[PDB]
Amino acid sequence: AIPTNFSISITTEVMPVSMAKTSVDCNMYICGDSTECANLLLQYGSFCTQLNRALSGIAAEQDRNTREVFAQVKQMYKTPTLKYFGGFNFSQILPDP
Amino acid sequence: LKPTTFMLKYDENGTITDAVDCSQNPLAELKCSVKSFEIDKGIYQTSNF
Numbered sequence: 001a002i003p004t005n006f007s008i009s010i011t012t013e014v015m016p017v018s019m020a021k022t023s024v025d026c027n028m029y030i031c032g033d034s035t036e037c038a039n040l041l042l043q044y045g046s047f048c049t050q051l052n053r054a055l056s057g058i059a060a061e062q063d064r065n066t067r068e069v070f071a072q073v074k075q076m077y078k079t080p081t082l083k084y085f086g087g088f089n090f091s092q093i094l095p096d097p
Numbered sequence: 098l099k100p101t102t103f104m105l106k107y108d109e110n111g112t113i114t115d116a117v118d119c120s121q122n123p124l125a126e127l128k129c130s131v132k133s134f135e136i137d138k139g140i141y142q143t144s145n146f
């Protein structure tokens with residue numbers, strides 16, 4: 001069997017790339033407006049130091065993810081004024097001034 | 098005298114060769130947090146406010 005006619009399909013595809021980067025102040029959460037908590041926390045040490053390093057390390061990767069996908073061209077091209085090219089109407093994918 | 102925090106470099110022969118405040122400017126507190134005298138360019142997170 002050999003096919004004769006054909007068809008053309010456009011198939012969508014959804015992929016996540018990022019995630020909302022966060023940050024947490026310790027004493028607003030683990031102390032919560034009391035100095036005596038902060039008078040007690042210093043026994044435990046600089047755990048606020050290490051977690052801020054970790055979460056910002058996540059936050060560096062989130063900008064790193066978006067940058068490694070998109071930032072691949074080296075000329076900033078211009079959208080042409082025409083949007084219809086021999087039966088190819090790009091009126092829905094290009095932006096509009 | 099005042100209650101502060103310093104950072105001291107010892108040499109090979111156990112001699113105090115250099116010190117730094119942790120209170121005079123944000124630049125020295127950056128040296129206090131990263132624990133180094135020479136700091137390359139970039140942003141660096143430090144303590145809260």
Ligand SMILES: *[C@@H]1O[C@H](CO)[C@@H](O[C@@H]2O[C@H](CO)[C@@H](O[C@@H]3O[C@H](CO)[C@@H](O)[C@H](O[C@H]4O[C@H](CO)[C@@H](O)[C@H](O)[C@@H]4O)[C@@H]3O)[C@H](O)[C@H]2NC(C)=O)[C@H](O)[C@H]1NC(C)=O
Nearest residue numbers: 082083084085086087088089090091092093094095096097
């Ligand atoms: C490429 O594809 C685009 C797809 O958007 C296509 O553009 C659209 O064309 C249609 C007509 O073919 C436009 O519809 C008309 O636009 C005018 C201007 O906005 C409106 O005033 C019109 O509304 C009146 O007329 C209608 C029928 O008479 C009534 O139903 C209506 O209530 C009003 O009385 C009508 O909507 C449409 O706006 C454009 N859209 C865009 C985004 O340009 C274009 O034609 C294609 N080109 C080629 C070469 O294939």
Ligand SMILES: *[C@@H]1O[C@H](CO)[C@@H](O[C@@H]2O[C@H](CO)[C@@H](O[C@@H]3O[C@H](CO)[C@@H](O)[C@H](O)[C@@H]3O)[C@H](O)[C@H]2NC(C)=O)[C@H](O)[C@H]1NC(C)=O
Nearest residue numbers: 104105106107108109110111112113114115116133134135
């Ligand atoms: C730590 O202390 C030691 C000794 O307490 C220091 O070593 C001494 O360094 C000096 C400087 O180089 C030496 O003097 C020179 O010695 C050479 C070789 O003998 C000679 O050719 C020169 O004319 C000059 O005299 C000294 O000999 C040396 N002594 C010893 C026991 O090693 C060391 O430099 C100190 N280091 C720091 C970082 O403070």
